[PDB]
Amino acid sequence: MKVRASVKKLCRNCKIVKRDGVIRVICSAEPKHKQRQG
């Protein structure tokens, strides 16, 4: 999980979600793309 002010879909499986209003990127393939904040 990386903390960057700018988040983007790194891969196809990379989806977008606004958990608790805090933008975050989760993946079901490579658990290396998990992102937060943005």
Partner RNA sequence: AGCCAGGAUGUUGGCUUAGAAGCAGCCAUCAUUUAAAGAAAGCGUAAUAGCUCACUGGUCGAGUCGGCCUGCGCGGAAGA
Binding residues: 11, 14, 27, 33
Nearest residue to 13 (alpha-carbon basis) of 36, 37, 32? 32
Instruction: Tell me the binding residues for Zn(2+).
Output: 11, 14, 27, 33
Separation of alpha carbons 32 and 21, rounded Å: 22
Should residue 5 be labelled a site residue for RNA when binding is judged by CB under 7 A? Answer: yes
Q: Which of 23, 24, 26, 27 binds RNA (CB under 7 A)?
A: 23
Per DSSP, 22 falls in state E
How many other CB atoms sit within 10 Å of the CB of residue 30?
Answer: 11
Binding site for RNA (CB under 7 A): 5-6, 11-12, 21-23, 37-38
Binding site for Zn ion (CB under 5 A): 11, 13-14, 27, 33
